[PDB]
From a paper:
Ring-shaped enzymes called AAA+ unfoldases help to recycle these proteins by unfolding their amino acid chains. The 83 kDa VAT protein, which is composed of an N-terminal regulatory domain (NTD) and two tandem nucleotide-binding AAA+ domains (NBD1 and NBD2), assembles into a 500 kDa homohexamer. Truncation of the first 182 residues of VAT removes the regulatory NTD, producing a construct (ΔN-VAT) that has both higher ATPase and unfoldase activity than the intact protein. All AAA+ unfoldases have conserved sequences that extend from the NBDs towards the center of the ring, forming ‘pore loops’ that are essential for unfolding substrate.
Similarly, ΔN-VAT with bound ATPγS forms a mixture of fibrils as well as single particles, the majority of which appeared to be six-fold symmetric (red circles). Single particle cryo-EM analysis was performed, excluding the fibrils by inspecting micrographs after automatic particle selection and manually deselecting particle images that were part of a filament. This process allowed calculation of a cryo-EM map of the six-fold symmetric stacked-ring conformation of VAT at 3.9 Å resolution. First, removal of the NTDs in ΔN-VAT makes the complex more structurally homogeneous and allowed specimens to be prepared with thinner ice than could be used with full length VAT. In the structure, a central pore runs along the six-fold symmetry axis of the complex through the center of the stacked NBD1 and NBD2 rings (left, hexagon). In the six-fold symmetric VAT structure, pore loop 1 of NBD1, containing conserved and essential tyrosine residues (Tyr264 and Tyr265), forms an opening that is ~28 Å across while pore loop 2 of NBD1 (residues 299 to 305) forms a slightly tighter aperture that is ~18 Å across (left). Similar apertures are produced by the corresponding pore loop 1 of NBD2 (containing conserved residues Trp 541 and Val 542) and pore loop 2 of NBD2 (residues 575–579) (left). The stacked-ring structure of VAT resembles recent structures of the VAT homologue p97 in the fully ATP-loaded state, except for the orientations between the NBD1 and NBD2 domains in VAT protomers and the relative rotation of the NBD1 and NBD2 rings. Consequently, the six-fold symmetric stacked-ring state with ATPγS bound and the split-ring state with ADP bound likely correspond to pre- and post-unfolding conformations of the enzyme.
Residue numbers in the entry:
A (entry chain A), B (entry chain C): 183 to 726
Write the structure that this text describes.
């Protein structure tokens, strides 16, 4: 096969891939670079990534990069052969490296040499562990030998291998970026046939990933397979005549971009349970009213990250974040995404149901992992929704998960975040009081920004922005409903415009421009979720 | 390699290193010192330290210290070789020592000979255990043989090895001191090239560690590696032309001190979860008002530790400590650090969220470990913040962690501390009543010092101290806001001066001197967190 694993295969790993390649090649082409400054390159390296992220693929490309002799050793077969000859085999590879040195010691998907740090007492497991530690020991500075590895679990590997002088440098490659997803799906398109250069399809492939925040590379490379198999069904019967494929019609059946759109289903993506990063596309234009908060909230979040220097000339402490509180449906979930979306900085999404929900929850650490993933990805703004559920007051809930896993965990995490650090915490919840008052302590959350319900005058703006996609009638006027009622939120009016469609649809089977009457009947169909009684609740709850 | 492991490599271990060296060398150069007085030096010794603290390194230096024949035996490879030949190998080393005696029996990172005290029943594990106990047994008084070892877990080693006559003396080296951190980072600078003697950089290196309380030595030695790798990236492309390094530009690329500042990130320090020691730099000048409390609190803490003798001439019992209670934001967290910071005595920091939070919390022992780390490090003052969370009243919380791990544990710990002992307990919490009244029993906490909210007259001082770093306007006067409102704490005014910057920034894009109006608009932006209603709460809560 003239075509072999090369860089162009990998995609979206450019920063990580670049660093790994640089370490190997700079050390590999010649030691003189590291030989002169700093220690020789660390022999062992661990590539920690979610499964099916391409780690296995990375090593081959690395091997082709400097031309060093390729070797690949796998945990599944490391101990494959019968016990007592396993150890001999492990030693043999190390012996093998010097002959072709400079060479690359290559093994992947290794849970076998270190099945568990302290849990497994098996001798076959133990013997290999020992030899490995020693081979690491048997490795010498002169040798152009590089050791590599990947694993599903970061800490699943032995802790001891962690001390430096063995596995000193580790780089973990995560899910590919939205633009990175294209590279993966783009390359496989080469074999994939579309009939034309189809830069639009390329642009189509661009959006193909955008249909979801992202997935694992492996599954993505499998997604393209779905289209082939699936799309092949339509043209498959015509060939049932005989076994040999007719040359009359040969490769004139091409997978249509719609095939993928039909292929995305049934492929059961989202095999990754790891913390994810997502950037929403919402824009302030989608935000009606609230000119004051947006203008101030923006300068609050944007200033520290975008203009840190000008913020230091004053000297006041930078903000660790702020919390949002108001009537349900004021758009908290929508606002945060806006500021986060507007800012280039990476975004992170946290859900109160999901935090208990996302993992076993036996350990609420996921949250402690959030900042770690957030800190590394900084500058970024972390978002926590329904922080109350996540951090209910301590007395109310008799559970380990509520207090032990998170509320206690939460105070510690906030201190860790730093102003220089590009991390920022934006909370939103229905009832501020429900959450532990401990979070309102000075320095944990600087200010509490209340979101007032949409004003009738603001209603005039809130309505157009949402119905812009909706076809409207020439006679129907939006401001009418605004002047009618002062009690409706944005969330209720959300469904309000929603129900209007049903009303307009109910009269006429085929869709037509909505009518003012279509709002009135629906206007009384859903009453305001916010009365003058609750407004006082927050007005008083604004102090605590 | 002419350069080999020597004392100068180690740093910050001077007391511990000195003691170990003395034990080996005094015994090693000649027995006559110990031979005449006291028993011969204990053959076995265990060096207990957090991982990556340099323990491994210590043995080599010790070996070079008296010139005794070096031998190093490691747990990873102790049992490395196939079972049934492992035991023979262990015996062989002991046999080996006499030939070159005086010699040093040297093995490190040993969990293998004693994988677990009672948990592991493996024969290979057991056989070695037995031989080890016996070799300890086979060791004889005449022999100039010294046995050493390190482990992550102190009690992880077998309990039996603990009885004297085997492993009698143990010294554990912890995290290096702030000044000690310099030694580590300083020595590696030798290979590290800066272009000049750069005593400033040395002073720069001085502060390099001060950016954080501290870390593990190993990681620190790795930190310098980050700069090399990271800093090498800027000058790395220019060499892409060919593999051989051009002699035209040779070592004219030097790591800049800013590189480290850029290197500190991404290095994921703080791999140590052990109890830590930190000394804050706060000074009373940073403390506005409260002339009475500081003057009295100082004489309360300082007197016993600094002037114990003059305190004994009276004869009254010394103080085990005292508790602080007052409105949130009165500066409790700030005051304690001040007195602790002012005093040379080492400081310890305890957080209520963190204590549940810091470890699994299944065992609240960490706290019992606190004093142990505190007692050994005395004279020092232990600090517990939000003692309520840590020690809520027993009836309110239905949890094992709250009562079993700590409140019950707490009473026992206090008795252990002694007046001669330089340990002192300074508590602070929002609500004294919330904590178990059991802590107010006589002798546990002598007095309860209430911190009154900042007085308007004191406000005049509180404001300047905080804004000293802030550029101010010639017309703007500080006392104005003081005479306006009697209800603001220090913590709220904290943000108050904070929000002022935003106000001043909001008008003018580039930062300029603040204006009186900038305070007024913000003055009403945040109302006092303490009204005349809460003051009565503490006024009455002052009795219990
Ligand atoms: N960024 C990427 N670039 C190219 N291929 C990728 C990428 N990520 C995943 N893959 C795909 O993964 C498949 C090979 O298996 P994979 O890469 O999953 O092994 P690995 O990720 O190294 O180890 P594991 O399979 O255990 O995760 C290839 O078909 C390859 O196209
Ligand atoms: N300023 C606004 N501009 C446009 N739409 C808004 C605005 N505020 C709220 N909405 C509407 O509210 C709907 C959902 O908001 P949501 O209820 O998620 O906010 P929230 O109630 O603060 O968050 P949560 O529901 O998680 O408590 C959106 O569909 C949006 O149309
Ligand atoms: N105080 C110190 N002085 C000099 N080097 C140190 C110190 N603390 C840690 N190190 C570094 O540790 C590295 C060697 O490994 P290390 O010292 O961590 O082994 P160990 O601490 O004896 O055992 P473990 O690695 O299991 O903790 C060396 O690069 C050394 O510079
Ligand atoms: N005497 C003082 N001088 C200067 N600043 C003070 C003083 N008292 C309080 N402060 C201000 O209070 C802020 C934080 O104090 P903090 O709220 O931590 O004290 P506390 O409320 O007693 O402790 P905790 O918040 O843990 O209950 C500091 O930034 C400081 O500026």
């Amino acid at each position: 096969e003239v075509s072999r694993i090369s860089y162009e295969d990998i995609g979206g790993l450019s920063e990580q891939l670049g660093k790994i390649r640089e370490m190997i090649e700079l050390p590999l082409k010649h030691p003189e670079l590291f030989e002169r400054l700093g220690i020789t390159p660390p022999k062992g390296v661990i590539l920690y990534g979610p499964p099916g992220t391409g780690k296995t693929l990375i090593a081959r490309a690395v091997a082709n990069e400097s031309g060093a002799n390729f070797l690949s050793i796998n945990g599944p077969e490391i101990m494959s052969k019968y016990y007592g000859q396993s150890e001999q085999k492990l030693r043999e590879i190390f012996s093998k490296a010097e002959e072709t040195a400079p060479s690359i010691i290559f093994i992947d998907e290794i849970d076998s040499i270190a099945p568990k740090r302290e849990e497994v007492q098996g001798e076959v497991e133990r013997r290999v562990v020992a030899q490995l530690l020693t081979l690491m020991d048997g490795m010498k500075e002169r040798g152009h030998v590089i050791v590599i590895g990947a694993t599903n679990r970061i800490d699943a590997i032995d802790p001891a291998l962690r001390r430096p002088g063995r596995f000193d440098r580790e780089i973990e490659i995560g899910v590919p970026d939205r633009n990175g997803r294209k590279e993966i799906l783009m390359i496989h398109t080469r074999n994939m046939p579309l009939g034309m250069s189809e830069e639009e399809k390329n642009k189509f492939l661009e959006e193909m990933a955008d249909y979801t925040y992202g997935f694992v590379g492996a599954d993505l490379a499998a997604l393209v397979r779905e289209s082939a198999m699936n799309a092949l069904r339509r043209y498959l019967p015509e060939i049932d005549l005989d076994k040999p494929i007719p040359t009359e019609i040969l490769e004139k059946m091409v997978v249509t971009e719609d095939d993928f759109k039909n292929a995305l289903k049934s492929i059961e993506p989202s095999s990754l349970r790891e913390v994810m990063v997502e950037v929403p596309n919402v824009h302030w234009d989608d935000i009606g009213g609230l000119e004051d908060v947006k203008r101030e909230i923006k300068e609050t979040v944007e200033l520290p990250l975008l203009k840190p220097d000008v913020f230091k000339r004053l000297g006041i402490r930078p903000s660790k974040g702020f919390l949002l509180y108001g009537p349900p449906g004021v758009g908290k979930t929508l606002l945060a995404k806006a500021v986060a979306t507007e800012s280039n900085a990476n975004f992170i999404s946290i859900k109160g149901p999901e935090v208990l929900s996302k993992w076993v929850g036996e350990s609420e650490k996921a949250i402690r992992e959030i900042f770690k993933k957030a800190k590394q990805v900084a500058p970024a703004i972390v978002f926590l929704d329904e922080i109350d559920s996540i951090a209910p007051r301590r007395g109310t809930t008799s559970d380990s998960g509520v207090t032990e896993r998170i509320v206690n965990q939460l105070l510690t995490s906030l201190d860790g975040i730093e102003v220089m650090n590009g991390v920022v915490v934006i909370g939103a919840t229905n009832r501020p009081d429900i959450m532990d008052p401990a979070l309102l302590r000075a320095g944990r959350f600087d200010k509490l920004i209340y979101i007032p319900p949409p004003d009738k005058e603001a209603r005039l703006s809130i309505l157009k922005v949402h119905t812009k996609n909706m076809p409207l009638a020439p006679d129907v006027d939006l401001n009418d409903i605004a002047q009618r009622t002062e009690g409706y939120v944005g969330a209720d009016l959300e469904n309000l415009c929603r129900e209007a469609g049903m009303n307009a649809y109910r009269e006429n089977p085929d869709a037509t421009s909505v009518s003012q009457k279509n709002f009135l009947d629906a206007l009384k169909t859903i009453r305001p979720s916010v009365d003058e009684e609750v407004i006082k609740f927050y007005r008083t709850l604004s102090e605590t």
